[PDB]
Ligand binder design. Structure first.
Ligand SMILES: Nc1ncnc2c1ncn2[C@@H]1O[C@H](CO)[C@@H](O)[C@H]1O
Ligand SMILES: Nc1ncnc2c1ncn2[C@@H]1O[C@H](CO)[C@@H](O)[C@H]1O
Ligand SMILES: [K+]
Ligand SMILES: [K+]
Ligand SMILES: [K+]
Ligand SMILES: [K+]
Ligand SMILES: [Mg+2]
Ligand SMILES: [Mg+2]
Ligand SMILES: [Mg+2]
Ligand SMILES: [Mg+2]
Lengths: 380, 374, 380, 374
């Protein structure tokens, strides 16, 4: 019955993640001035360049140079020696108005609850009782390891740390009547960018003692746990230098780390009419409500939409055999407790609030301060 | 016992898919001249612009003006009236190409990344793929065919489809009963009327693609649901490489452990090993060992052979998951270098993978089952 | 004593001129909302692309996509068949704030009259009594031929005309005690973009009869005047297609067509603190005031500046031998009648007004509606 | 009888001059592999960005990453602290290159543009150039020399200079009396103080460059007149090719009929014929025929020989303007193809022309006088 599972996470300096964070900084800037801004901001990062491309219709007046550069500064790129500098990089902007064909078809002249989905697509929600955050342990640990790196970097506990990082966590699992039971951490891989003025031995020791031991519960670590710390050796240069990144290229990392399923839509740079984000958030909220409500131990939720149509086209519940209720009974409960129109989801989850930059690293799910992470008390 | 499941696909002129096709055209162009080229090509598309970005190690000299413009012409974007024109678009090249290692070039006498790849196969179609995503793909292909042959000359290249199937289950296998809902949105000229479009989409597209047994009086049609789709392509929506990874794979079914395919050469194990894991899954189903199967392959830093393989048959096999694993190990060598030899992955066939799905197609080595010995 | 002289002019669709006009559309957009905007907007045009690059510090909120596209539409590029389309071209924007080192050094915390020159440089003014506009006849005729093409194109008199054009006018001159006397037009070259649906014979006839005869005084045209009309044959595609243009690459065309001298500075995209524009305008005003005042028949004026310094570093007057007064006497007259500080020039010539897009084709000099073309009555 | 005249020059790291040097580096790279390459390369520079745009017909395969980055490194922009770094800048390539004509490539057995070009020469310096622009150039060169040898290591690459000379005239010749005003603005580090900079600029730069006879107690110095120039290069001011055409030529003296030089091959007659007209003017002065001279050469559509040549000697010749014209016609063939052979203009020497002036330099064929027969 046993298996290994591995999830990845990347730090704020990974070029794909730079792009997600910039995209969401641009979104939040619009939303601070215009709660109804329509935003579809894609970011591209490569040697010496950030480019913004997409569609925005907004009453806000946003200084894109400042927003981009300040976000790059926040990430921690302020020098050639690091591979990238917010002060001297190229910032190119190709942002236009949202197509009138789209605007007319989705949101123009409609009451808020009746706003059409901004696009077709499918979205999944997932939850699992194996952690208190109702997330897979592999992806929880991978994200927490990258967050701890950035925390220690920014407060000066390990001042040699730089922004680019990647972590991979392999956990050995047992199964229990469709639930999954994590038993031990099999392997932890951590690669992190660093200043020239530190040796590998010191870094590797710090990674084990100040990062891994601070984050991973001791019960899961044992004599046979494999540690690959700076496995490729030195990593002085990182970020976009000799690399290319794009918004929405870490969607598995952003969600459940390979668990459950994904509908393919990216989250970052998109306002709530883009169901790729708002309905995946709501479906997470549904999944977590079902598990915390004690209706199942593990659950996958699918929803889908058509451009310009307010209501979901389909809703599906898969409980992995972990409920006394049938999947049809759970679906009926979901339909009685949730209204998954984007114009209702927006009110329920407060999705005009400019909190999206916070979502763009360390996973969109599993943190308690977001409204989709507060379970709904269900009536049935 | 019944449930719904939904998958989508997009056309060749969807802006994200334009980028996947260009990224793979770039890969193919390199491989044609240098079979050992290393390519990590990202494409970005917005109004008027094709931007290429990324890292290449290669001996090839590629004419990007030609490669990009021919791809765009082939997709069908050849006039400003359509929103994009291969003749007049801006091709920006930001690719960083270097020569291969000098010392090894003169060495005339001749993978480590912790993660997992998933393969999936189901007997519900002959493609060994979910019906939802098979139909979604074929609906886009049909639109391109009818556009290109002049049957529906009001069609433009950008299209999206979505199919919801009502299924029942039988001992872990999934049995399609009927198509519940079809969405089609396709870019169009300024003369055709909405009634005429909706009729053609049902009668000449959907009914030519979906087996009649799956269509009934209750099937729901959302055809041109936005009302007007004249602006399309990159003009309407920015595109990037690797933003249709679920379209490229299994449509929400099975699992995905991360990574996009297009614009990456065969040494990127998250492409090559995903193709191998598909090959294994399809071999098990076509071999009659499983009706449905998820093949999960983990690789470790410092091991070439997989760290571990798990086979999840959903209860559709008489044999245990452990017995199937033993059959897999005796019949497949999933070291990444062996994969690339067995599936002939140095050949420039990647552009063809970049629309209508990487899986389920009638034309790639990973879609040819291996005859298993056991 | 005789010589030939040739000047060129280009139409609004010439790729360099597209860039000047866009640069000045961006300037005027800023100035409409913020009269004190600092603008240094360079434009680049090539196949399917307009890029803006430079420095702007302004209270205005400017929609660069709309400003660029509307200017391209105004020029007349709205279809692939023409080589360029405002609807579907790429517009990239790389506009940042003016460097604080520059701002502090030039204009910050200073009274308006004491504002420092925005840069060092040298500038020339020129005037000549050979036309009523006080301009060389070669450049007057070259500009007027391109203007007449755009006029007839836009009002539908010759609907096959497209925006790209180039004209070259060779005039035979005599000299008269340092003045120049135009005698005859030696050669007129006109190339103009056109729709596919017209033949060369019809175009050539129209160019002679509706353009050249409407614009060039009959006295200068004779039996030996050489006409090269569509000399390279068909010209269906023009503008940025397979070409590249930049702001400030037509500075000779913009000024005196090869006559007098040039200090090297471009005009378009620059607010009045950039002496490259404001002091060249003032020096034109000085030159024209001297000629119309009857102090000389032909005159060249030089001025120069240092970054951050309000006053000119040098002023020089060269009268070609066409005055009874010495060059030193004329200089003394100029210094008594003009204050060539940029902060004074701005008030005299009304240079915060958003009229700059009008300057960007058909020459900055010679038109009566601009304040630098109204002679100052001189006291001496 | 005295007057002032002012000319300027800029350093290698002035952003417009960066672009001229890159455009000509691109030209040279093409010519090194293909002497018949046609090049019209525009460079744009702004914070973090080198953009190449333009049309090329050539058989060469050029590594733009290398050509651009090496040029920037050579100029001295190698760290973010200086505002620009060759290591980390974005190189965007939008050049459109095509192969030469297929039919003529197989033709194995082997200019029309109405306009004028001006040449100018003056005996006031040995360079045969105005003192104003000679001094302005040399002041920038001195700054680069002292920066590069570590004498003044607080110097950065971006610099501008301007020199105003008080002249008298003698029968049309111009005689420099004294330097009236010097401006120097040069980018600098964050540690050096303004007093120290101003002293070094006067004592180690100006006094090492300007002949002492021209400096006096009344010479006006504007050294670092802005007060602070730490931000510089493309970060501070966008650069473009062909925006220093007066710096490249005669500094306001003589005349200019239009056109920039850099990034254009020898078949662009407004480069080649401008060089020839300089050659003619310098030959007349060095031959003792003129002290000062403006050579005006007109070309006509459909004539290879110039349509007309006028020689304006300002009264500095015993011979009439007509007699000088006859000497020019007997000694020079100004057909553009003959020019390119005589001045050896297919050689890749253009990058060297792109800073410190095209005229007056000790190293180009157009600056070597022709011995005249008359
Ligand atoms: N007016 C429209 N109606 C329906 N779909 C559209 C429209 N415009 C663009 N699309 C499609 O939706 C995607 C996301 O906006 C585009 O890439 C395109 O395929
Ligand atoms: N703070 C400054 N002081 C003086 N000159 C400057 C400053 N910043 C830039 N420059 C120079 O002036 C030019 C135009 O702004 C630049 O290319 C640069 O050479
Ligand atoms: K059990
Ligand atoms: K998009
Ligand atoms: K006379
Ligand atoms: K500039
Ligand atoms: Mg999507
Ligand atoms: Mg997309
Ligand atoms: Mg200037
Ligand atoms: Mg400049």
């Amino acid at each position: 019955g046993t298996f290994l599972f591995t999830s990845e996470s990347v730090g704020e300096g990974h070029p794909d993640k730079i792009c997600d964070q910039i995209s969401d900084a641009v979104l939040d800037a619009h939303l601070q001035q215009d709660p109804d801004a329509k935003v579809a901001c894609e970011t591209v990062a490569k040697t010496g360049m950030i480019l913004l491309a997409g569609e925005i219709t907004s009453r806000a007046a946003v200084d894109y140079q400042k927003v981009v550069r300040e976000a790059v500064k926040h990430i921690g790129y302020d020098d050639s020696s690091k591979g990238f500098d917010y002060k001297t990089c190229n910032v190119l902007v190709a942002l236009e108005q949202q197509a009138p064909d789209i605007a007319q078809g989705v949101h123009l002249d409609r009451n808020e609850e009746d706003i059409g989905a901004g696009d077709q697509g499918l979205m999944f929600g997932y939850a699992t009782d194996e952690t208190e955050e109702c997330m897979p342990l592999t992806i929880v640990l991978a994200h927490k390891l990258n967050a701890k790196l950035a925390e220690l970097r920014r407060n000066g506990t390990l001042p040699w740390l730089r922004p680019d990082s990647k972590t991979q966590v392999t956990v050995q699992y047992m199964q229990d009547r469709g639930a999954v039971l994590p038993i031990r951490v099999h392997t932890i891989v951590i690669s992190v960018q660093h200043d020239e003025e530190v040796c590998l031995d010191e870094m590797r020791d710090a990674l084990k003692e100040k990062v891994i031991k601070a984050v991973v519960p001791a019960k899961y670590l044992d004599e046979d746990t494999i540690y690959h710390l700076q496995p490729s050796g030195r990593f002085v240069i990182g970020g976009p230098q000799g690399d290319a990144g794009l918004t929405g290229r870490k969607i598995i990392v952003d969600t459940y780390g390979g668990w459950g399923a994904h509908g393919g839509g990216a989250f970052s740079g998109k306002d709530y009419t883009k169901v790729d984000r708002s309905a995946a958030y709501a479906a997470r909220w549904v999944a977590k409500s079902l598990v915390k409500g004690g209706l199942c131990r593990r659950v996958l939720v699918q929803v889908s939409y058509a451009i310009g149509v307010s209501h979901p086209l389909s809703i599906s519940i898969f409980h992995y055999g972990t409920s006394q209720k049938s999947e049809r009974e759970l679906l009926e409960i979901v339909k009685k407790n949730f209204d998954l129109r984007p114009g209702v989801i927006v009110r329920d989850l407060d999705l005009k609030k400019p909190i999206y930059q916070r979502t763009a690293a360390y996973g969109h799910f599993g943190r308690d301060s977001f409204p989709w992470e507060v379970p709904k008390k269900l009536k049935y």
